[PDB]
Symmetry: C3
């Protein structure tokens, strides 16, 4: 399983990505819910009012029943238009949030894959170091059993070998936790993963930092969220300023009234005083309203929206400083990874030559066995450092493509063509 | 003070636990507040309306006063039943939150206690290493003062001794910060804590990981929070779908009207045109309402609740992946701690033998004084690593009992029976 | 650019500080918005109601138009006074939040400045170590080219030199990331910063911890936020208990009614049955309301507010424990920094003497070249540790002045007088 197939399995079933997709679609249905109250509203009503009279109403009872039909439709209300535009802008913010955690999904599965590969070759280098130290210990024990060296050398070799055994144990644990992190990201357990080439692994210097700064100012998704939040705050200002505005709405009705009377006073001139009525009504009428003075509520809301807009502009400037820091730090990290790859290749070559030299010097009696053992540790530390530098170079390539906001599937396709051969994620 | 007494003092007075208990009881009183609006509501009203007429009402004044008594009781309203069930489910979620930070309190006081003990024996091992290196330096100074060795050996011993002095200083600082963390957790300062046995400290391999996975799927509290959030979201769907429903409510009243008239037009036929009235009324009447079309608000609310339910199911799946990762990582950590305990015991034995060997080789002239000093550092590093491995084994036992959701007081009782002897938390 | 000028540029243009200032001013305008509804409210109204009759109203049409003017002013409403006092307390909480992230701005720019200086002298010490090891390698190569030493020594020196080259690369990267962090804090790129004196750098022991505890109990801003949140919760209790209270409000009006009639039944006795009216009205009337029983809503709100007050008091106690832990940990850190400065000065002196001794012993044939190289590494590690201890002492001075809540500009003025000389933030 190479990186592309891991990402194909991950994007298809990651829970956080689908949760963000659910939030995006909920925001679009909120657009529909905010466009709702500008439409016609129909509602039916009915009543059945028993009544009783007393204290100069004694003997007057009534059973008034009714059944109405309402219709409401606003004619000029600016606040509902403002709420509709605000919901559209909030859905745009939710859409760019979905885009940015698509990017974060790609970055997370890439760093989990490379953490697994780094744990694999750290375990393999620790195993090779343990093998070399055990070979030295076995050779010195064969020397001691014929009486050629003292027991100090085999005891020092035994001590070094036991320390490397403990390091191998904790390296195996780190491998198991790394593959558990990969399972937690993708949802699958992988027996083998494609490893990295080392014989044709070449590094490329990135673009100049000004071109990256211009592309980050054009394309970074956090800066887009900040810009959309700023224009949303300006729309909040407009929403309060249109809270100043008057109102006008239309209302229609259709209702039947079936009032009837009973009681002792209705045994009098109930004809034309309290008589039954089959009355129906068709009503259609406007309604105007104009808030003149509200105690300064709308002015305080305008000033609150202005202070919130100033805060949103400061949020935009903070996000701009953060993205500048991000692209400059990742640029420095890429150059650091290239220089450290070259330095660690040179260090590996020199440490190998030094290990051969100290082995010859120990065989001639210039160096001790402790010299051979710590030369071995320095060599395998240099090898582990070289592997870490390679994986840091690849993850910094992904970080510079994410901070530009252009991280997508084809970058994974490129550094998936970087990978070559299947290595097992669980050796014996 | 052993671990059980520390937990008894901590659970009795920890602020975060009592804050969660306050939130739980607030949720139950919210259940009562949500069952409130289905009950009778009584409210009294009164008026005193002075009036004045003009423009074909000139000469008509009125002083209409009134005093009413209202009663309201809904008959068929499904939304209030939905709100009651939603508040019951929210209180269940608050109850399992109280349960899970009970568990987190137990885990936090356990890890603070073991951090204090680990800082204690790291300080004691650094002190013993400083004592051994000072003994070597004093012996080489006594050798140099009679003119047996060169000044290079005593200068190397002085350099190593000063480095170990600085390490002792920072170890003492780590001990003080650890006991301050314990005071911040429990609220008490402890002069002495019960230390760990080493002569009868035995490790037990945990259960197979499938049994732990089944018990974690049955009992983990985060998975219970996810399940209750999912069925809460399904109840939100039902709440919108019952927002489709019609309504019906009952209303009773009892009011007196004491209208009186005055003015120039009431000097006319105010008898039976504008005459005083002592009128009282007993009213009891129903009210029906049926929303036919609302501009699609209820359909958009249904689709929003469905998208929120899909998001809650994705939250459930993410919590399931997280608890699988947690139990597998803690299982691997337990096995790692057992293997590292065995490896570090072997390393301690071999490093002690190697230190004796290099001391004899230095006394015969095979090794240097630098050999004795770094052999001492490797020995005391192995001792510190063994102590760290023991405490990591105990805290991983607690982590596997917490990730199963079964962590309680009796597990602290067991690994409190593991502890034996009081050691001071502040030596000189 | 010393620390004072960096702070002057930072406080003038930091985005987070201005965002908090915007939130503070928004809270004060919320005070005005909450004092709004106790003032007069004026609102105009108008109608135009076409009507139609049928089913014992057939032949009765009406075109009733109107234009009113409303005035509303509450007389006795305790809930609005409670909301006003609650908004005043919330604005006080926002003000102390603005104060505490003023303090956090000062602490952040101080720690960024000292991180840059620490990265600078770590890079310079690594460069000096690389220079010394290269000098040793060149001297041994000149010895080997005349046939005085073996090739093992120059190969060991080459291996050590390549390892120090890799360390120099990553130190240069750490310097670049530190100056990028400083740019992200202040907004400016600094070519040179004022460095620290070492020839007149003296340390002062802090106050006794009880005086710091009393001053932290009087002046710490998190404890003030906790106290204001607690009295806000008590005001919430009072707000529910005054939700028990009755109500009383005043209402005035002025409206014209211009009803006219048309239809077939108005061709009858429309004179005095359905005749036109120019009717105007001046109305001024009170309104009383008293909630007798609400289904226990107000009692459940009182119990919810009481549980929230208990939770706020537990929050206060947790903040008290946290500030006690903060001042005690920073006190221990200051004493640790003083003791480690003394220990590292002694270690630097002894390591320098030991390096000279092992150089002489290598020249006489007692020590090897590996002895000289790791003596050099221990010396330069001691130098880096001394520099780190000095900067930790200064940042712990700032932490003890921040945890006392008294951190301001003049403390930066004092430890800005500590700084002396401009060093470049980007060497070649």
């Amino acid at each position: 399983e190479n990186l592309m197939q891991v990402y194909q399995q991950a994007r298809l079933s990651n829970p956080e990505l689908r949760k963000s997709a659910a939030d995006r679609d909920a925001a679009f249905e909120k657009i529909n819910e905010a466009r709702s109250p500008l439409l016609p509203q129909l509602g039916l009503g009915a009543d059945y009012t028993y009544s009783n009279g007393y204290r100069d109403a004694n003997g007057i009872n009534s059973n008034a029943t009714s059944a109405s039909l309402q219709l409401t439709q606003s004619i000029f209300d600016m606040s509902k238009w403002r709420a509709l535009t605000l919901q559209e802008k909030a859905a745009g913010i939710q859409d760019v949030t979905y885009q940015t955690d698509q990017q974060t999904l790609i970055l997370n599965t890439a760093t989990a894959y490379f953490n697994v590969l780094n744990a694999i070759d750290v375990l393999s280098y620790t195993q090779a170091q343990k093998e070399a130290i055990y070979r030295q210990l076995d050779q010195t024990t064969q020397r001691f059993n014929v009486g050629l060296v003292a027991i100090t050398d085999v005891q020092n070799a035994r001590a070094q070998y036991d320390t490397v055994l403990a390091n191998e144990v904790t390296a195996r644990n780190n491998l198991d936790n790394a593959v558990e992190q990969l399972r937690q990201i993708t949802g699958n357990y992988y027996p083998e993963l494609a490893a990295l080439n080392v014989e044709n692994f070449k590094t490329d210097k990135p673009q100049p930092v000004n071109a990256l700064l211009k592309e980050a100012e054009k394309r970074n998704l956090s800066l887009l969220q900040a810009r959309l939040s700023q224009d949303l705050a300006r729309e909040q200002i407009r929403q309060a300023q249109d809270g100043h505005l008057p109102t006008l709405d239309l209302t229609a009705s259709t209702g039947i009234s079936d009032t009837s009377y009973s009681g002792s006073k209705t045994r009098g001139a109930a004809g034309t005083q309290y008589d039954d009525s089959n009355m129906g009504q068709n009503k259609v009428g406007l309604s105007f309203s104009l808030p003149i003075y509200q105690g300064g509520m709308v002015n305080s809301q305008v000033k609150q929206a202005q202070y919130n807009f100033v805060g949103a502009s400061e949020q935009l400037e903070s996000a701009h400083r953060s993205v500048v820091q991000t692209v400059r730090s990742s640029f420095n990290n890429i150059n650091a990874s290239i220089s450290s790859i070259n330095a660690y290749k040179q260090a590996v070559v020199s440490a190998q030559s030094s290990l051969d030299a100290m082995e010859a010097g120990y065989s001639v009696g210039t160096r001790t066995i402790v010299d051979v053992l710590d030369a071995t540790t320095t060599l395998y530390n240099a090898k582990q450092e070289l592997a870490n530098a390679r994986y840091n170079y690849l993850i910094n390539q992904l970080n510079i493509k994410s901070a530009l906001g252009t991280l997508n599937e084809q970058d994974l396709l490129a550094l998936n063509n970087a990978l070559s051969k299947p290595v097992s994620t669980n050796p014996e």
